[PDB]
Amino acid sequence: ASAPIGSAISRNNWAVTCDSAQSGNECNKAIDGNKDTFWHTFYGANGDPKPPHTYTIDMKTTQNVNGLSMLPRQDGNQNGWIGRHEVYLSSDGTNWGSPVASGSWFADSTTKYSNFETRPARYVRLVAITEANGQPWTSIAEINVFQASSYTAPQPGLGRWGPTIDLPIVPAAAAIEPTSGRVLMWSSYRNDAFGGSPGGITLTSSWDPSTGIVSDRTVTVTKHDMFCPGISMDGNGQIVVTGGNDAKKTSLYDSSSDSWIPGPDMQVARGYQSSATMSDGRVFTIGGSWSGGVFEKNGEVYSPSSKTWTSLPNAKVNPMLTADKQGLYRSDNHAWLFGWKKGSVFQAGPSTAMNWYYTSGSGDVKSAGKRQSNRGVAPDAMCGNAVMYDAVKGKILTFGGSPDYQDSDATTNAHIITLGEPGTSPNTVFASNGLYFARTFHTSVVLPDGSTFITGGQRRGIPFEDSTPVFTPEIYVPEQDTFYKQNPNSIVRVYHSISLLLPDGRVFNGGGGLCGDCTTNHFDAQIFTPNYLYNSNGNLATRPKITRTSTQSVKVGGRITISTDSSISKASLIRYGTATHTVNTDQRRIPLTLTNNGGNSYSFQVPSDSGVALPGYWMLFVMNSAGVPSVASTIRVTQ
Protein backbone atom coordinates (compact mmCIF):
# COMPACT_ATOMS: atom_id res chain seq x y z
CA ALA A 1 0.00 0.00 0.00
CA SER A 2 0.72 3.73 -0.11
CA ALA A 3 -0.73 6.69 1.75
CA PRO A 4 -1.54 10.36 1.21
CA ILE A 5 0.31 13.06 3.12
CA GLY A 6 -2.89 14.93 4.16
CA SER A 7 -6.40 14.42 5.54
CA ALA A 8 -9.42 13.71 3.41
CA ILE A 9 -11.55 16.64 2.49
CA SER A 10 -15.30 16.44 3.15
CA ARG A 11 -17.09 15.76 -0.08
CA ASN A 12 -20.48 17.26 1.08
CA ASN A 13 -20.62 20.54 -0.82
CA TRP A 14 -18.63 19.35 -3.86
CA ALA A 15 -19.74 19.62 -7.43
CA VAL A 16 -18.09 17.39 -10.07
CA THR A 17 -17.80 17.41 -13.86
CA CYS A 18 -16.85 14.67 -16.24
CA ASP A 19 -16.07 14.69 -19.87
CA SER A 20 -18.56 11.76 -20.44
CA ALA A 21 -20.43 9.46 -18.01
CA GLN A 22 -22.42 6.36 -18.96
CA SER A 23 -25.87 6.33 -17.20
CA GLY A 24 -25.39 4.13 -14.12
CA ASN A 25 -21.77 5.36 -14.19
CA GLU A 26 -22.32 8.99 -13.29
CA CYS A 27 -19.56 11.43 -12.53
CA ASN A 28 -20.85 11.40 -8.96
CA LYS A 29 -20.46 7.63 -8.31
CA ALA A 30 -16.79 8.61 -7.94
CA ILE A 31 -17.71 10.58 -4.81
CA ASP A 32 -20.45 8.48 -3.24
CA GLY A 33 -18.49 6.63 -0.51
CA ASN A 34 -19.31 3.35 -2.27
CA LYS A 35 -16.41 1.45 -3.64
CA ASP A 36 -18.88 -0.67 -5.60
CA THR A 37 -19.93 2.31 -7.63
CA PHE A 38 -17.85 4.11 -10.17
CA TRP A 39 -17.82 6.84 -12.79
CA HIS A 40 -17.27 5.41 -16.29
CA THR A 41 -16.92 7.27 -19.58
CA PHE A 42 -19.17 6.42 -22.52
CA TYR A 43 -19.02 3.01 -24.00
CA GLY A 44 -20.88 0.72 -26.35
CA ALA A 45 -24.01 2.47 -27.54
CA ASN A 46 -22.78 5.90 -26.42
CA GLY A 47 -19.68 5.21 -28.45
CA ASP A 48 -16.15 4.77 -27.11
CA PRO A 49 -14.51 8.26 -26.99
CA LYS A 50 -10.70 7.99 -26.41
CA PRO A 51 -8.74 9.67 -23.59
CA PRO A 52 -8.00 12.30 -22.47
CA HIS A 53 -10.83 11.93 -19.98
CA THR A 54 -11.20 14.47 -17.20
CA TYR A 55 -12.61 14.71 -13.70
CA THR A 56 -13.06 18.22 -12.32
CA ILE A 57 -14.00 18.95 -8.75
CA ASP A 58 -15.33 22.17 -7.41
CA MET A 59 -14.77 22.10 -3.68
CA LYS A 60 -16.79 25.37 -3.47
CA THR A 61 -14.17 26.68 -1.17
CA THR A 62 -10.38 27.06 -0.91
CA GLN A 63 -8.44 24.18 0.67
CA ASN A 64 -4.75 23.71 1.31
CA VAL A 65 -4.57 20.67 -1.04
CA ASN A 66 -1.59 18.29 -0.85
CA GLY A 67 -2.91 15.17 -2.60
CA LEU A 68 -5.51 13.00 -4.22
CA SER A 69 -6.41 9.28 -4.09
CA MET A 70 -7.93 7.36 -6.92
CA LEU A 71 -9.54 4.01 -6.15
CA PRO A 72 -10.06 2.05 -9.36
CA ARG A 73 -13.12 -0.14 -10.09
CA GLN A 74 -13.18 -3.07 -7.74
CA ASP A 75 -15.40 -5.36 -9.73
CA GLY A 76 -12.74 -7.55 -11.30
CA ASN A 77 -12.85 -5.60 -14.57
CA GLN A 78 -9.81 -3.62 -15.66
CA ASN A 79 -11.51 -1.28 -18.14
CA GLY A 80 -10.80 2.27 -17.45
CA TRP A 81 -7.73 1.81 -15.18
CA ILE A 82 -5.78 5.11 -15.47
CA GLY A 83 -2.20 4.84 -16.84
CA ARG A 84 -0.76 8.32 -17.69
CA HIS A 85 -2.37 11.21 -15.89
CA GLU A 86 -1.88 14.83 -14.81
CA VAL A 87 -3.27 16.62 -11.76
CA TYR A 88 -4.14 20.35 -11.91
CA LEU A 89 -5.25 22.89 -9.43
CA SER A 90 -7.16 26.16 -9.86
CA SER A 91 -8.40 28.96 -7.64
CA ASP A 92 -10.81 29.98 -10.42
CA GLY A 93 -11.78 27.06 -12.75
CA THR A 94 -10.37 28.54 -15.85
CA ASN A 95 -6.75 29.01 -15.11
CA TRP A 96 -5.22 25.61 -14.34
CA GLY A 97 -1.51 26.29 -14.98
CA SER A 98 1.02 23.47 -15.05
CA PRO A 99 0.17 20.06 -13.53
CA VAL A 100 1.16 19.79 -9.86
CA ALA A 101 1.69 16.00 -10.49
CA SER A 102 1.85 13.78 -13.52
CA GLY A 103 3.23 10.34 -14.42
CA SER A 104 1.84 6.82 -14.68
CA TRP A 105 0.01 4.54 -12.30
CA PHE A 106 0.63 0.82 -12.22
CA ALA A 107 -1.96 -1.39 -13.88
CA ASP A 108 -3.69 -2.93 -10.86
CA SER A 109 -6.80 -2.34 -8.75
CA THR A 110 -5.07 -0.79 -5.74
CA THR A 111 -5.80 2.78 -4.64
CA LYS A 112 -3.33 5.11 -6.45
CA TYR A 113 -2.21 8.45 -5.01
CA SER A 114 -0.80 11.78 -6.13
CA ASN A 115 1.12 13.52 -3.18
CA PHE A 116 2.41 17.08 -3.97
CA GLU A 117 3.43 20.24 -2.16
CA THR A 118 0.56 22.09 -0.50
CA ARG A 119 -1.20 24.60 -2.68
CA PRO A 120 -4.43 26.60 -1.93
CA ALA A 121 -7.09 25.64 -4.47
CA ARG A 122 -10.84 25.49 -4.75
CA TYR A 123 -10.70 23.38 -7.91
CA VAL A 124 -8.98 20.11 -8.77
CA ARG A 125 -8.81 18.33 -12.05
CA LEU A 126 -7.43 14.92 -12.83
CA VAL A 127 -6.81 14.21 -16.53
CA ALA A 128 -6.52 10.52 -17.50
CA ILE A 129 -4.21 10.79 -20.53
CA THR A 130 -4.12 7.04 -21.03
CA GLU A 131 -5.83 3.84 -19.95
CA ALA A 132 -3.62 1.28 -18.31
CA ASN A 133 -4.12 -1.22 -21.17
CA GLY A 134 -4.54 1.27 -24.01
CA GLN A 135 -8.38 1.24 -24.24
CA PRO A 136 -10.55 4.34 -24.48
CA TRP A 137 -12.35 4.46 -21.11
CA THR A 138 -11.69 5.93 -17.79
CA SER A 139 -13.40 4.63 -14.63
CA ILE A 140 -12.95 5.78 -11.01
CA ALA A 141 -14.76 4.01 -8.08
CA GLU A 142 -13.88 6.74 -5.62
CA ILE A 143 -11.82 9.97 -5.71
CA ASN A 144 -10.58 11.87 -2.63
CA VAL A 145 -8.68 15.09 -2.08
CA PHE A 146 -6.41 15.74 0.90
CA GLN A 147 -5.49 18.85 2.75
CA ALA A 148 -2.55 19.90 4.87
CA SER A 149 -3.02 21.26 8.39
CA SER A 150 -1.85 24.66 7.19
CA TYR A 151 -0.07 26.38 4.33
CA THR A 152 3.25 28.22 4.49
CA ALA A 153 4.50 29.80 1.28
CA PRO A 154 8.00 28.71 0.29
CA GLN A 155 10.53 31.37 1.22
CA PRO A 156 12.12 33.37 -1.56
CA GLY A 157 15.66 32.47 -2.52
CA LEU A 158 15.51 28.93 -1.03
CA GLY A 159 14.70 26.74 -4.07
CA ARG A 160 11.38 25.20 -4.83
CA TRP A 161 9.99 21.66 -4.77
CA GLY A 162 7.63 20.36 -7.51
CA PRO A 163 6.16 18.99 -9.48
CA THR A 164 5.57 15.41 -8.35
CA ILE A 165 6.24 12.67 -10.91
CA ASP A 166 3.82 9.69 -10.19
CA LEU A 167 5.39 6.30 -11.03
CA PRO A 168 4.31 2.64 -11.39
CA ILE A 169 7.12 1.52 -9.03
CA VAL A 170 9.08 2.49 -5.92
CA PRO A 171 12.33 3.85 -7.55
CA ALA A 172 14.82 2.29 -4.98
CA ALA A 173 17.63 2.33 -7.64
CA ALA A 174 18.06 4.88 -10.40
CA ALA A 175 20.55 6.06 -13.03
CA ILE A 176 20.53 8.89 -15.65
CA GLU A 177 20.79 7.27 -19.23
CA PRO A 178 23.54 9.61 -20.50
CA THR A 179 22.69 9.43 -24.22
CA SER A 180 19.00 10.03 -23.68
CA GLY A 181 18.80 12.21 -20.60
CA ARG A 182 16.14 9.90 -19.15
CA VAL A 183 16.06 8.84 -15.47
CA LEU A 184 16.13 5.00 -15.41
CA MET A 185 14.66 3.54 -12.22
CA TRP A 186 14.15 -0.05 -11.02
CA SER A 187 12.62 -1.85 -8.09
CA SER A 188 12.78 -5.59 -8.00
CA TYR A 189 10.78 -8.58 -9.24
CA ARG A 190 7.72 -6.47 -8.26
CA ASN A 191 6.75 -2.79 -8.37
CA ASP A 192 6.40 -2.59 -4.61
CA ALA A 193 8.36 -5.46 -3.11
CA PHE A 194 11.55 -7.43 -3.14
CA GLY A 195 10.93 -10.10 -0.48
CA GLY A 196 9.99 -13.43 -1.98
CA SER A 197 11.58 -13.01 -5.40
CA PRO A 198 12.07 -16.10 -7.58
CA GLY A 199 14.95 -13.93 -8.96
CA GLY A 200 15.58 -13.31 -12.69
CA ILE A 201 13.36 -10.39 -13.24
CA THR A 202 13.41 -6.71 -12.62
CA LEU A 203 10.77 -4.05 -13.22
CA THR A 204 12.27 -0.88 -14.60
CA SER A 205 10.60 2.46 -15.42
CA SER A 206 12.10 5.52 -17.25
CA TRP A 207 11.03 9.10 -16.94
CA ASP A 208 11.85 11.46 -19.82
CA PRO A 209 12.20 15.00 -18.50
CA SER A 210 11.78 16.52 -21.98
CA THR A 211 8.42 14.75 -22.61
CA GLY A 212 7.22 14.00 -19.06
CA ILE A 213 6.58 10.44 -20.29
CA VAL A 214 7.07 7.59 -17.82
CA SER A 215 7.76 4.30 -19.70
CA ASP A 216 7.99 0.83 -18.06
CA ARG A 217 9.86 -2.35 -19.02
CA THR A 218 10.40 -5.72 -17.37
CA VAL A 219 13.98 -6.94 -17.78
CA THR A 220 14.47 -10.67 -17.86
CA VAL A 221 17.22 -11.09 -20.44
CA THR A 222 19.97 -10.79 -17.83
CA LYS A 223 18.18 -13.22 -15.51
CA HIS A 224 18.76 -10.79 -12.66
CA ASP A 225 16.45 -9.31 -9.96
CA MET A 226 18.57 -6.13 -9.58
CA PHE A 227 17.36 -5.02 -6.16
CA CYS A 228 20.16 -4.27 -3.62
CA PRO A 229 23.06 -4.06 -6.07
CA GLY A 230 26.39 -2.50 -6.76
CA ILE A 231 26.12 0.16 -9.55
CA SER A 232 28.94 1.75 -11.58
CA MET A 233 29.16 3.52 -15.04
CA ASP A 234 32.29 1.86 -16.55
CA GLY A 235 34.96 3.41 -18.72
CA ASN A 236 32.77 2.78 -21.81
CA GLY A 237 29.63 4.48 -20.49
CA GLN A 238 27.78 1.17 -19.79
CA ILE A 239 26.01 0.97 -16.34
CA VAL A 240 27.27 -2.21 -14.55
CA VAL A 241 24.61 -3.55 -12.05
CA THR A 242 25.90 -6.32 -9.73
CA GLY A 243 24.30 -8.79 -7.41
CA GLY A 244 21.54 -8.03 -4.96
CA ASN A 245 18.55 -10.42 -5.35
CA ASP A 246 20.55 -12.59 -7.87
CA ALA A 247 23.75 -12.39 -5.84
CA LYS A 248 26.31 -13.37 -8.59
CA LYS A 249 24.87 -11.74 -11.62
CA THR A 250 26.04 -8.71 -13.53
CA SER A 251 23.59 -6.94 -16.01
CA LEU A 252 24.90 -4.20 -18.33
CA TYR A 253 22.72 -1.31 -19.47
CA ASP A 254 23.83 0.30 -22.72
CA SER A 255 22.26 3.81 -23.01
CA SER A 256 23.13 4.03 -26.73
CA SER A 257 21.14 1.02 -27.80
CA ASP A 258 18.67 1.37 -24.87
CA SER A 259 19.41 -2.23 -23.96
CA TRP A 260 20.24 -4.72 -21.21
CA ILE A 261 23.13 -7.18 -21.78
CA PRO A 262 24.07 -10.09 -19.54
CA GLY A 263 27.55 -9.50 -18.05
CA PRO A 264 29.90 -12.09 -16.57
CA ASP A 265 29.04 -13.47 -13.09
CA MET A 266 31.11 -11.99 -10.28
CA GLN A 267 33.54 -14.34 -8.52
CA VAL A 268 31.80 -13.75 -5.17
CA ALA A 269 28.01 -13.43 -4.66
CA ARG A 270 27.16 -10.14 -2.95
CA GLY A 271 24.40 -7.79 -2.16
CA TYR A 272 24.63 -4.18 -0.84
CA GLN A 273 28.27 -3.82 -1.83
CA SER A 274 29.47 -0.58 -3.42
CA SER A 275 31.37 -0.72 -6.77
CA ALA A 276 33.53 2.12 -8.09
CA THR A 277 34.85 2.92 -11.61
CA MET A 278 38.66 3.01 -11.76
CA SER A 279 41.05 5.36 -13.64
CA ASP A 280 41.28 2.68 -16.40
CA GLY A 281 37.50 2.19 -16.94
CA ARG A 282 37.49 -1.07 -14.87
CA VAL A 283 34.99 -1.53 -12.00
CA PHE A 284 36.15 -2.58 -8.51
CA THR A 285 33.72 -3.97 -5.85
CA ILE A 286 34.25 -5.24 -2.30
CA GLY A 287 32.01 -6.48 0.51
CA GLY A 288 28.24 -6.96 0.16
CA SER A 289 26.99 -9.48 2.81
CA TRP A 290 23.31 -8.53 2.29
CA SER A 291 23.00 -11.54 -0.06
CA GLY A 292 25.12 -14.41 -1.28
CA GLY A 293 26.12 -15.35 2.29
CA VAL A 294 27.77 -13.62 5.15
CA PHE A 295 31.60 -14.04 5.19
CA GLU A 296 34.59 -11.92 4.25
CA LYS A 297 34.08 -10.75 0.63
CA ASN A 298 37.45 -9.29 -0.66
CA GLY A 299 37.84 -7.21 -3.82
CA GLU A 300 37.20 -8.27 -7.37
CA VAL A 301 37.61 -6.19 -10.53
CA TYR A 302 35.53 -6.20 -13.76
CA SER A 303 37.25 -5.57 -17.13
CA PRO A 304 34.73 -4.25 -19.77
CA SER A 305 37.26 -5.15 -22.52
CA SER A 306 37.65 -8.83 -21.65
CA LYS A 307 34.30 -9.03 -19.91
CA THR A 308 35.67 -10.91 -16.90
CA TRP A 309 35.52 -10.50 -13.14
CA THR A 310 38.85 -11.21 -11.49
CA SER A 311 39.25 -11.82 -7.81
CA LEU A 312 41.68 -9.57 -5.84
CA PRO A 313 41.95 -11.55 -2.61
CA ASN A 314 44.61 -9.36 -1.14
CA ALA A 315 42.37 -6.25 -1.39
CA LYS A 316 40.91 -7.26 1.93
CA VAL A 317 37.61 -6.18 3.21
CA ASN A 318 38.60 -6.58 6.89
CA PRO A 319 39.99 -3.03 7.53
CA MET A 320 36.91 -1.27 6.19
CA LEU A 321 34.33 -3.13 8.33
CA THR A 322 32.20 -0.93 10.67
CA ALA A 323 31.43 -2.15 14.20
CA ASP A 324 27.76 -2.71 13.29
CA LYS A 325 25.84 -4.56 16.08
CA GLN A 326 24.28 -6.86 13.44
CA GLY A 327 27.74 -7.91 12.40
CA LEU A 328 29.14 -8.60 8.95
CA TYR A 329 25.66 -8.82 7.41
CA ARG A 330 25.70 -4.99 7.56
CA SER A 331 29.31 -4.03 8.31
CA ASP A 332 30.69 -4.44 4.79
CA ASN A 333 27.83 -2.59 3.13
CA HIS A 334 27.69 0.61 1.07
CA ALA A 335 31.36 1.54 1.28
CA TRP A 336 32.14 5.21 0.43
CA LEU A 337 34.33 4.31 -2.61
CA PHE A 338 36.02 6.66 -5.05
CA GLY A 339 38.17 5.61 -8.12
CA TRP A 340 41.35 7.65 -7.81
CA LYS A 341 44.77 7.82 -9.36
CA LYS A 342 46.58 4.91 -10.77
CA GLY A 343 44.00 2.14 -10.45
CA SER A 344 43.57 3.02 -6.76
CA VAL A 345 40.21 3.10 -5.00
CA PHE A 346 39.85 5.31 -1.84
CA GLN A 347 37.35 4.10 0.89
CA ALA A 348 36.37 7.16 2.95
CA GLY A 349 33.98 5.26 5.31
CA PRO A 350 31.44 4.53 6.61
CA SER A 351 33.94 2.96 9.03
CA THR A 352 36.02 5.44 11.02
CA ALA A 353 39.04 3.73 9.36
CA MET A 354 39.73 5.05 5.80
CA ASN A 355 41.70 2.82 3.39
CA TRP A 356 43.53 2.85 0.05
CA TYR A 357 42.64 -0.17 -2.16
CA TYR A 358 45.15 -1.06 -4.95
CA THR A 359 44.22 -3.19 -7.96
CA SER A 360 47.58 -4.39 -9.32
CA GLY A 361 48.51 -8.09 -8.95
CA SER A 362 46.14 -9.79 -6.52
CA GLY A 363 45.27 -6.48 -4.86
CA ASP A 364 46.31 -4.61 -1.77
CA VAL A 365 44.86 -2.39 1.00
CA LYS A 366 46.77 0.22 2.98
CA SER A 367 45.44 2.31 5.93
CA ALA A 368 44.70 5.96 5.11
CA GLY A 369 44.08 6.73 8.79
CA LYS A 370 40.85 7.73 10.62
CA ARG A 371 38.07 10.11 9.70
CA GLN A 372 38.53 12.69 12.48
CA SER A 373 38.82 16.49 13.12
CA ASN A 374 39.64 18.79 16.11
CA ARG A 375 36.32 17.62 17.49
CA GLY A 376 37.51 14.00 17.83
CA VAL A 377 37.62 10.77 15.87
CA ALA A 378 34.40 10.27 13.89
CA PRO A 379 32.26 7.28 14.75
CA ASP A 380 31.06 4.78 12.09
CA ALA A 381 28.48 6.42 9.84
CA MET A 382 26.60 3.68 8.06
CA CYS A 383 24.33 5.28 5.37
CA GLY A 384 26.15 8.64 5.70
CA ASN A 385 26.78 10.12 2.23
CA ALA A 386 30.07 11.05 0.59
CA VAL A 387 30.44 13.44 -2.36
CA MET A 388 33.63 14.32 -4.36
CA TYR A 389 32.76 17.94 -5.10
CA ASP A 390 36.18 19.05 -6.41
CA ALA A 391 37.94 16.11 -7.99
CA VAL A 392 40.79 18.37 -9.10
CA LYS A 393 41.58 19.25 -5.52
CA GLY A 394 40.59 15.77 -4.19
CA LYS A 395 37.83 17.22 -1.98
CA ILE A 396 35.22 14.93 -0.57
CA LEU A 397 32.44 16.05 1.78
CA THR A 398 31.02 13.29 4.08
CA PHE A 399 27.96 13.74 6.32
CA GLY A 400 25.22 12.11 8.31
CA GLY A 401 24.68 8.38 8.89
CA SER A 402 24.65 6.35 12.13
CA PRO A 403 26.90 3.83 13.95
CA ASP A 404 24.54 1.01 13.09
CA TYR A 405 22.47 0.38 10.03
CA GLN A 406 19.15 0.62 11.99
CA ASP A 407 17.85 1.40 15.49
CA SER A 408 20.62 3.96 15.93
CA ASP A 409 20.52 7.81 16.03
CA ALA A 410 21.94 9.65 13.01
CA THR A 411 24.68 12.30 13.47
CA THR A 412 25.16 15.85 12.25
CA ASN A 413 28.89 15.08 11.73
CA ALA A 414 30.27 16.41 8.46
CA HIS A 415 33.86 16.30 7.22
CA ILE A 416 35.99 17.44 4.34
CA ILE A 417 38.64 14.93 3.23
CA THR A 418 41.33 16.08 0.89
CA LEU A 419 43.03 13.32 -1.05
CA GLY A 420 46.57 13.40 -2.33
CA GLU A 421 48.52 10.54 -3.84
CA PRO A 422 47.30 7.04 -3.24
CA GLY A 423 49.07 5.64 -0.18
CA THR A 424 49.20 8.92 1.72
CA SER A 425 46.97 9.80 4.69
CA PRO A 426 44.54 12.45 3.53
CA ASN A 427 43.82 15.53 5.58
CA THR A 428 40.35 15.58 7.13
CA VAL A 429 38.71 18.57 8.88
CA PHE A 430 35.18 19.19 10.17
CA ALA A 431 32.72 20.84 7.74
CA SER A 432 31.52 24.11 9.27
CA ASN A 433 29.44 23.22 12.35
CA GLY A 434 28.00 19.97 10.85
CA LEU A 435 24.48 19.45 9.42
CA TYR A 436 21.56 21.48 10.66
CA PHE A 437 19.74 18.12 11.01
CA ALA A 438 21.04 14.69 11.97
CA ARG A 439 19.99 12.30 9.27
CA THR A 440 20.52 8.77 7.94
CA PHE A 441 19.13 7.27 4.63
CA HIS A 442 19.36 10.84 3.20
CA THR A 443 20.70 11.38 -0.41
CA SER A 444 22.74 14.05 -2.02
CA VAL A 445 24.19 15.38 -5.20
CA VAL A 446 26.93 17.78 -6.19
CA LEU A 447 25.48 20.75 -8.14
CA PRO A 448 27.09 22.65 -11.07
CA ASP A 449 28.45 25.34 -8.74
CA GLY A 450 30.28 22.95 -6.38
CA SER A 451 27.63 23.14 -3.65
CA THR A 452 26.25 19.85 -2.28
CA PHE A 453 22.45 19.38 -2.01
CA ILE A 454 21.40 17.05 0.87
CA THR A 455 17.88 15.87 1.40
CA GLY A 456 15.55 13.39 3.15
CA GLY A 457 16.57 10.90 5.84
CA GLN A 458 15.33 10.51 9.43
CA ARG A 459 17.00 11.05 12.68
CA ARG A 460 16.78 7.43 13.86
CA GLY A 461 17.19 4.75 11.20
CA ILE A 462 14.14 2.58 11.07
CA PRO A 463 13.85 1.07 7.58
CA PHE A 464 10.27 1.09 6.10
CA GLU A 465 9.11 3.47 8.81
CA ASP A 466 8.45 7.09 7.92
CA SER A 467 9.37 8.33 11.41
CA THR A 468 11.53 11.28 12.52
CA PRO A 469 11.53 12.58 8.92
CA VAL A 470 13.74 15.54 7.98
CA PHE A 471 11.79 17.64 5.42
CA THR A 472 14.32 20.53 5.26
CA PRO A 473 17.07 19.97 2.77
CA GLU A 474 20.45 21.71 3.29
CA ILE A 475 23.14 22.93 0.80
CA TYR A 476 26.85 23.06 1.76
CA VAL A 477 28.74 26.02 0.07
CA PRO A 478 32.38 25.08 0.09
CA GLU A 479 33.70 28.65 -0.61
CA GLN A 480 31.94 29.78 2.51
CA ASP A 481 32.23 26.56 4.58
CA THR A 482 28.60 27.10 5.47
CA PHE A 483 25.47 25.00 5.39
CA TYR A 484 22.13 26.63 4.31
CA LYS A 485 18.64 25.30 4.95
CA GLN A 486 16.41 25.24 1.76
CA ASN A 487 12.59 25.23 1.48
CA PRO A 488 11.16 22.04 3.01
CA ASN A 489 9.18 19.41 1.12
CA SER A 490 6.18 17.30 2.24
CA ILE A 491 7.05 13.76 1.25
CA VAL A 492 9.13 11.59 3.57
CA ARG A 493 12.29 10.29 1.80
CA VAL A 494 13.95 7.67 4.11
CA TYR A 495 15.20 4.20 3.41
CA HIS A 496 15.27 3.26 -0.26
CA SER A 497 15.15 6.85 -1.49
CA ILE A 498 17.34 8.26 -4.25
CA SER A 499 18.60 11.59 -5.59
CA LEU A 500 20.14 12.30 -9.02
CA LEU A 501 21.34 15.49 -10.69
CA LEU A 502 19.29 16.00 -14.00
CA PRO A 503 21.12 17.43 -17.10
CA ASP A 504 18.98 20.60 -16.69
CA GLY A 505 20.58 21.29 -13.31
CA ARG A 506 17.50 20.40 -11.27
CA VAL A 507 17.51 17.46 -8.70
CA PHE A 508 15.28 14.42 -8.98
CA ASN A 509 14.49 12.97 -5.50
CA GLY A 510 12.21 9.99 -5.08
CA GLY A 511 11.51 6.53 -3.77
CA GLY A 512 11.43 5.17 -0.29
CA GLY A 513 9.72 2.05 0.98
CA LEU A 514 9.50 -1.10 -1.13
CA CYS A 515 7.91 -3.15 1.72
CA GLY A 516 4.94 -4.74 -0.09
CA ASP A 517 1.92 -4.29 2.20
CA CYS A 518 3.47 -1.48 4.24
CA THR A 519 1.87 1.88 3.81
CA THR A 520 5.29 3.55 3.43
CA ASN A 521 5.83 2.82 -0.26
CA HIS A 522 6.34 6.05 -2.17
CA PHE A 523 5.57 5.57 -5.86
CA ASP A 524 6.86 8.93 -6.88
CA ALA A 525 9.63 11.53 -7.04
CA GLN A 526 9.72 15.32 -6.79
CA ILE A 527 11.91 17.81 -8.60
CA PHE A 528 13.87 20.37 -6.49
CA THR A 529 14.82 23.54 -8.41
CA PRO A 530 17.81 25.24 -6.83
CA ASN A 531 17.72 28.98 -6.32
CA TYR A 532 20.48 29.38 -9.05
CA LEU A 533 17.65 28.92 -11.58
CA TYR A 534 15.62 31.94 -10.39
CA ASN A 535 16.33 35.68 -10.61
CA SER A 536 15.44 38.08 -7.71
CA ASN A 537 11.76 38.37 -8.68
CA GLY A 538 11.18 34.65 -8.09
CA ASN A 539 10.89 34.05 -11.85
CA LEU A 540 13.09 31.61 -13.69
CA ALA A 541 16.38 33.31 -14.74
CA THR A 542 17.52 33.36 -18.36
CA ARG A 543 20.20 30.67 -18.90
CA PRO A 544 23.42 30.89 -20.95
CA LYS A 545 23.37 28.66 -23.93
CA ILE A 546 26.10 26.48 -25.31
CA THR A 547 25.85 27.15 -29.04
CA ARG A 548 28.82 25.09 -30.12
CA THR A 549 31.07 22.25 -28.92
CA SER A 550 34.21 21.38 -30.95
CA THR A 551 33.73 17.75 -29.92
CA GLN A 552 31.54 15.57 -27.80
CA SER A 553 34.24 12.91 -27.16
CA VAL A 554 37.63 13.82 -25.55
CA LYS A 555 40.63 12.05 -24.20
CA VAL A 556 41.93 12.95 -20.75
CA GLY A 557 44.27 15.91 -21.22
CA GLY A 558 42.22 16.94 -24.32
CA ARG A 559 40.88 20.38 -25.17
CA ILE A 560 37.37 21.43 -25.90
CA THR A 561 36.24 24.65 -27.42
CA ILE A 562 32.77 26.08 -27.01
CA SER A 563 30.83 29.17 -28.11
CA THR A 564 28.12 30.54 -25.80
CA ASP A 565 25.42 33.15 -26.31
CA SER A 566 26.61 35.23 -23.41
CA SER A 567 29.74 35.71 -21.52
CA ILE A 568 30.46 32.96 -19.03
CA SER A 569 32.19 33.24 -15.72
CA LYS A 570 32.53 29.55 -14.65
CA ALA A 571 32.21 26.07 -16.03
CA SER A 572 32.21 22.61 -14.44
CA LEU A 573 32.10 18.98 -15.61
CA ILE A 574 29.82 16.70 -13.61
CA ARG A 575 30.10 12.95 -14.10
CA TYR A 576 26.66 11.28 -14.60
CA GLY A 577 25.30 9.57 -11.43
CA THR A 578 23.87 6.25 -10.36
CA ALA A 579 22.17 5.75 -7.03
CA THR A 580 20.76 3.25 -4.53
CA HIS A 581 20.75 2.86 -0.69
CA THR A 582 22.54 6.17 -0.19
CA VAL A 583 25.45 5.20 -2.49
CA ASN A 584 26.47 7.16 -5.61
CA THR A 585 30.09 6.30 -6.67
CA ASP A 586 29.66 7.75 -10.17
CA GLN A 587 28.99 11.49 -9.59
CA ARG A 588 31.94 13.88 -9.11
CA ARG A 589 32.73 17.42 -10.23
CA ILE A 590 35.66 18.93 -11.97
CA PRO A 591 35.84 22.74 -11.86
CA LEU A 592 37.21 23.95 -15.24
CA THR A 593 39.64 26.75 -15.93
CA LEU A 594 38.45 28.66 -19.04
CA THR A 595 40.55 30.37 -21.66
CA ASN A 596 38.64 33.36 -23.08
CA ASN A 597 39.13 33.19 -26.83
CA GLY A 598 37.22 36.52 -27.17
CA GLY A 599 33.75 36.70 -28.75
CA ASN A 600 32.04 34.37 -26.26
CA SER A 601 34.35 31.58 -27.41
CA TYR A 602 36.16 29.57 -24.69
CA SER A 603 38.33 26.53 -24.30
CA PHE A 604 39.33 24.37 -21.42
CA GLN A 605 41.42 21.30 -20.97
CA VAL A 606 40.04 18.13 -19.29
CA PRO A 607 42.48 16.99 -16.58
CA SER A 608 45.11 14.67 -17.84
CA ASP A 609 44.77 12.23 -14.89
CA SER A 610 42.05 9.64 -15.55
CA GLY A 611 41.83 9.01 -11.75
CA VAL A 612 40.53 12.64 -11.51
CA ALA A 613 38.68 12.69 -14.87
CA LEU A 614 37.31 9.21 -14.58
CA PRO A 615 36.25 7.89 -18.00
CA GLY A 616 32.55 7.72 -18.91
CA TYR A 617 29.97 10.41 -19.60
CA TRP A 618 29.99 13.84 -18.10
CA MET A 619 27.78 16.87 -18.13
CA LEU A 620 29.27 20.26 -19.13
CA PHE A 621 27.66 23.23 -17.41
CA VAL A 622 28.64 26.92 -18.04
CA MET A 623 27.51 29.68 -15.54
CA ASN A 624 26.99 33.41 -16.27
CA SER A 625 28.23 36.07 -13.85
CA ALA A 626 24.82 35.86 -12.26
CA GLY A 627 25.51 32.20 -11.33
CA VAL A 628 22.85 30.74 -13.57
CA PRO A 629 23.87 27.52 -15.21
CA SER A 630 23.16 26.39 -18.78
CA VAL A 631 21.52 22.95 -19.36
CA ALA A 632 24.36 20.48 -19.66
CA SER A 633 26.16 19.36 -22.79
CA THR A 634 27.15 15.65 -22.62
CA ILE A 635 30.81 14.92 -23.22
CA ARG A 636 32.28 11.39 -23.28
CA VAL A 637 35.76 11.32 -21.55
CA THR A 638 37.89 8.40 -22.68
CA GLN A 639 41.41 7.39 -21.50
Ligand SMILES: [Cu+2]
Ligand atom coordinates in the same frame (compact mmCIF):
# COMPACT_ATOMS: atom_id res chain seq x y z
CU1 LIG B 1 17.44 -2.27 0.93
Ligand code: NA
Ligand atom coordinates in the same frame (compact mmCIF):
# COMPACT_ATOMS: atom_id res chain seq x y z
NA1 NA C 1 -18.24 5.21 -5.85
